[PDB]
Design a protein around this ligand. Sequence first.
Ligand SMILES: *CC(=O)N1CCN(S(=O)(=O)c2ccccc2F)CC1
Ligand SMILES: *CC(=O)N1CCN(S(=O)(=O)c2ccccc2F)CC1
Lengths: 304, 304
Amino acid sequence: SGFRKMAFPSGKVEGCMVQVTCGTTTLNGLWLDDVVYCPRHVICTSEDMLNPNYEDLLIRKSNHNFLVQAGNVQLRVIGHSMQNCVLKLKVDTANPKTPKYKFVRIQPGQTFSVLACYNGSPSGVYQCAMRPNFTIKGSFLNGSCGSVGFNIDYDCVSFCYMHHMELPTGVHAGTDLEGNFYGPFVDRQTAQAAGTDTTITVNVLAWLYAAVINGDRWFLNRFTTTLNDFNLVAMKYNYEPLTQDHVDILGPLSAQTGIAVLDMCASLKELLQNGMNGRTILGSALLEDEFTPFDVVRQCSGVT
Amino acid sequence: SGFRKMAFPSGKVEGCMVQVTCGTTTLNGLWLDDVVYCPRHVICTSEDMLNPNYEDLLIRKSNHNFLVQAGNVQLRVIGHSMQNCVLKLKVDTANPKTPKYKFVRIQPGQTFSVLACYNGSPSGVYQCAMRPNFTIKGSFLNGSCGSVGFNIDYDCVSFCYMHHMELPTGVHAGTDLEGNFYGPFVDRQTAQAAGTDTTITVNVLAWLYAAVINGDRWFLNRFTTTLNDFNLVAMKYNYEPLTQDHVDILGPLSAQTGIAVLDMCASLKELLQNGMNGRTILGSALLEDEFTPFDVVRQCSGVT
Ligand SMILES: *CC(=O)N1CCN(S(=O)(=O)c2ccccc2F)CC1
Ligand SMILES: *CC(=O)N1CCN(S(=O)(=O)c2ccccc2F)CC1
């Protein structure tokens, strides 16, 4: 029993983190096989960051200008290319600790673990979600760029995020490992405002299921609703619309608890309309939306 | 910027987790050097757990009855002893992945990372605190016993917790790595009620400092207070008394923000008396008490 905001074990990713230096800029790189992936803004002077022309800036860079250090050992860079907003640095040594891995581009509402690093060294691990506005709410200081987000399926690490920048509002933007930003963001020090940070409804419902499973049941009511009725209330409260696809995904939690998805919707409707009245659910005073239905099943069943 | 509930990178501890089986009971063990540490209740039938006499139960156990598996390789047990509520299984092979380590007994209010494991395999990592009632609020299913809590100082893992049991109220009790329970708890399936779970005041104040550092400042007020006045309010709200030792510990956060500790106390006093009024601090609707002042400094400064 008990339900915690839980990250994947980070060891498989720790073994992949390196330091990348170009000129006076140091940030983190991901070493998989004989390639080191890092944010392309490693080539910029903070002056360059105002309006950088990356292709033009890159012309002035040779293999030997990219200093890649794995622990206290230097890797030999034998090639470099830009793919979207990442650099791929080819090194002469395959990372001996390369896990089984995939690059995935996640959807908004999907959760992942971040291994926050500075100078290629791990400082911490925490759980995030891709927000519906394609930001993440992370913990990233100068030097953390190139830190990665991931999921693990048993022995296979799916890398989904690389950290690139902080918006003026202190929320975070980054890329998949093909260098494509989540959302409309660009690696430039310019006016970039996030859109509405809506609540991930399907994740809230998953977490309400988790609460019931773990004995927190006070919010279960006598009501049901319909997707359309629920969705009118969702809209009003800046919650994402609930689809039949979301209902289908919640089916196993429905099955386990015997609470129909639409009944749990009606409970969530009353919590939105009535608030918590000073009560808590799984030690939270607000409705948590950074657990997926898969997260709840995984944690509640003990998958390794 | 941004402030997250952050665990230590888990890799150094992942390399230490093994499976221990005695009869039909499987749980986790910690392999450091040529010793495997696990809960002594591994020797019990769930029948035994009602009123176990561990010394008597242990007489019936030989080295060869303790099945220790590290990945898919069996370790040879050449000795076993009971120390308090843990077994030490001597194996013929030093764990080649043994990190630098210490065993520490932490105080209430101190935070640590848990690597939740099943069958010696890591499932997740999350941040806990030793509650003032010597429970922890974890996430532990059957099979998770022998999972450990730890802190890392650069390269040295301080092990502070081993998971042993769930109270009827779904909170958790365990031992240090010398097998001594935190609090009054015993490894027996009996009536064990937790005392008052008080709020860790010094940690709340640390987290209020973290909020200011990260731009969440709405709760800063025009008031100050004294330790004695604050403490009258703390008592009323089931907050731990604040000592000058706590004020001293918060000094660096005071220095960095320019907010005197007693001023921040007066802010916390008004939040206790007035509530949050539907507002949030660092994305929380309640006052978070599972960050230590050291945690806030570490995360805000980017220690690896
Ligand atoms: C994103 C990231 O982690 N980095 C880019 C900025 N650099 S830096 O130019 O060295 C720097 C250092 C300190 C303050 C601002 C700043 F831009 C660090 C790596
Ligand atoms: C604490 C812990 O993780 N364990 C002790 C209980 N055993 S068990 O006896 O195998 C068991 C299994 C399933 C349900 C209850 C139960 F006690 C597992 C390890």
